[PDB]
Amino acid sequence: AFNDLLQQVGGVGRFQQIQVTLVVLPLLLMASHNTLQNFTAAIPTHHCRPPADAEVWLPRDRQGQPESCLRFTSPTEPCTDGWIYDNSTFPSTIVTEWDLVCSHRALRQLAQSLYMVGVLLGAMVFGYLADRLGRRKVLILNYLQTAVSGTCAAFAPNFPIYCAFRLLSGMALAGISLNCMTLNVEWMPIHTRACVGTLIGYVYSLGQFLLAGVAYAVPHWRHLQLLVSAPFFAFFIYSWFFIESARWHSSSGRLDLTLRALQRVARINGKREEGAKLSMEVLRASLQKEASAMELLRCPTLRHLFLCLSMLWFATSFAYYGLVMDLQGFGVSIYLIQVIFGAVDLPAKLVGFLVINSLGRRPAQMAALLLAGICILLNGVIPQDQSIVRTSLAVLGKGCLAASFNCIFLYTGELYPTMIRQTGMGMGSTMARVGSIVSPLVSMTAELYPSMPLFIYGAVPVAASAVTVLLPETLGQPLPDTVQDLES
Numbered sequence: 021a022f023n024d025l026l027q028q029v030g031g032v033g034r035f036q037q038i039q040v041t042l043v044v045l046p047l048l049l050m051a052s053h054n055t056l057q058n059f060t061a062a063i064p065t066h067h068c069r070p071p072a073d074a075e076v077w078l079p080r081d082r083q084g085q086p087e088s089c090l091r092f093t094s095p096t097e098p099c100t101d102g103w104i105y106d107n108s109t110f111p112s113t114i115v116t117e118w119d120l121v122c123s124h125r126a127l128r129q130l131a132q133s134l135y136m137v138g139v140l141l142g143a144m145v146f147g148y149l150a151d152r153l154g155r156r157k158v159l160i161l162n163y164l165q166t167a168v169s170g171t172c173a174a175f176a177p178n179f180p181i182y183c184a185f186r187l188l189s190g191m192a193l194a195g196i197s198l199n200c201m202t203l204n205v206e207w208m209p210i211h212t213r214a215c216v217g218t219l220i221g222y223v224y225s226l227g228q229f230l231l232a233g234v235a236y237a238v239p240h241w242r243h244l245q246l247l248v249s250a251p252f253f254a255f256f257i258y259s260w261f262f263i264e265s266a267r268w269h270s271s272s273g274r275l276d277l278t279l280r281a282l283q284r285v286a287r288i289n290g291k292r293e294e295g296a297k298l299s300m301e302v303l304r305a306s307l308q309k310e311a312s313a314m315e316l317l318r319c320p321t322l323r324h325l326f327l328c329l330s331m332l333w334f335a336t337s338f339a340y341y342g343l344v345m346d347l348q349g350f351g352v353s354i355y356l357i358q359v360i361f362g363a364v365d366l367p368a369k370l371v372g373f374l375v376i377n378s379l380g381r382r383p384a385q386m387a388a389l390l391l392a393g394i395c396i397l398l399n400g401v402i403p404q405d406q407s408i409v410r411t412s413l414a415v416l417g418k419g420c421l422a423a424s425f426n427c428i429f430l431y432t433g434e435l436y437p438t439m440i441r442q443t444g445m446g447m448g449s450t451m452a453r454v455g456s457i458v459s460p461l462v463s464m465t466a467e468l469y470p471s472m473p474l475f476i477y478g479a480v481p482v483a484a485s486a487v488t489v490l491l492p493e494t495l496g497q498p499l500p501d502t503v504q505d506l507e508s
């Protein structure tokens with residue numbers, strides 16, 4: 021009867037209208053801190069530095085472009101001396117700093133892979149410790165860490181220090197993402213649980229505009245990192261004024277704290293007359309009513325569903341986080357491609373929302389996934405001579421994958437049974453990050469062929485699109501109460 025208590029104190033009042041906004045505001049930096057290795061680690065055109073013994077010193081080939089490997093040993097030797105990087109559009113990047121060109125090309129992918137590896141451990145550890153210390157405490161620690169370990173990376177004199185600090189920043193950021201929604205959805209009524217779920221998505225989708233503006237505003241990478249990591253201190257200074265969730269207090273066993281929090285929120289809302297009526301006995305009379313992860317194993321009915329759901333999550337995450345990177349090579353500047361990519365998610369979600377309930381849950385998923393897969397696989401045959409279809413197909417694929425993410429979230433939310441839903445959603449989201457981890461890993465094979473990663477990126481969604489035909493349709497049906505009655 022917690023919902024009735026919320027409607028008694030006022031339900032959706034000023035307390036919510038302040039706290040939800042002030043808790044969702046810092047999510048505008050997710051897009052900036054996630055896809056930063058497009059502006060902070062761009063590769064400009066470079067060539068071998070001739071010896072200081074002096075135009076014709078390099079074996080230029082492929083339409084006269086200077087060659088970056090050899091240096092005409094005699095007026096066929098490795099450089100081992102240095103490179104002359106261009107400074108017309110990219111004054112300084114990571115490759116310009118430690119010379120990760122033509123011999124250590126895979127280290128950019130390695131850094132991205134480590135940054136993504138530092139997301140799984142966060143989502144695990146700080147999700148475990150969120151239900152044992154308190155949402156607000158963990159949020160405060162996350163706010164402190166994202167600024168402490170994020171601003172000192174801009175002064176790293178070596179590569180491993182930068183990698184480790186980025187890993188820790190991702191560790192904090194993974195926890196902030198989960199805890200934000202976990203604390204936000206608790207204070208809202210049951211009838212407004214889906215409205216806030218879509219709110220976070222559009223907040224995330226707006227951060228690409230800020231990234232595009234800021235990157236142009238400051239070209240330097242150290243200053244860019246400092247600026248994108250600084251505001252977390254301001255967000256942290258105020259973060260002591262939040263109110264702990266009442267549901268967690270009630271479930272823990274301490275009802276006095278729940279009572280006090282209810283009175284306090286009543287004072288903020290201005291309904292103290294009902295708070296005074298609220299007492300200990302009525303709470304014990306109204307809330308008197310108030311699953312292992314291995315149960316998925318040794319029970320085929322849930323294992324069969326979980327396997328397919330995890331496969332879909334993995335395929336979607338792999339395709340999405342392989343697509344969004346490597347903006348270079350499209351002919352158009354990365355700055356413009358950023359805003360173009362950020363301008364296609366809104367219509368993707370808008371169209372997908374209608375089609376989940378109009379066409380069907382599974383029809384929409386299969387159509388979107390197949391279209392994205394074929395569109396991406398098509399990109400690997402047309403030559404780079406073109407400059408229009410290359411961008412059109414990429415943006416269409418990105419939007420389609422965003423719509424696929426919007427559809428699968430609701431599909432898994434409404435598919436699983438009631439009691440095991442909380443752990444099933446977490447397990448499904450867990451497999452949505454291994455694909456992101458492995459995305460930079462398979463891009464390292466670009467040395468073998470110049471489009472093999474692109475072919476790999478299109479085969480997985482195409483294969484997964486035919487896998488959705490093995491799940492029941494559940495449109496316009498009651499939520500399955502339990503496993504016993506779960507038959508159709």
Ligand SMILES: COc1ccc(Cl)cc1C(=O)NCCc1ccc(S(=O)(=O)NC(=O)NC2CCCCC2)cc1
Nearest residue numbers: 054197198201220221224225365422425426429449452
């Ligand atoms: C992965 O569960 C979601 C899927 C879609 C949306 Cl709307 C929200 C969530 C969500 O709240 N999960 C819990 C916490 C969370 C949030 C974001 C991320 S994320 O990985 O950094 N974001 C994305 O992948 N895509 C975004 C959203 C969809 C359009 C394109 C941009 C990872 C975890």
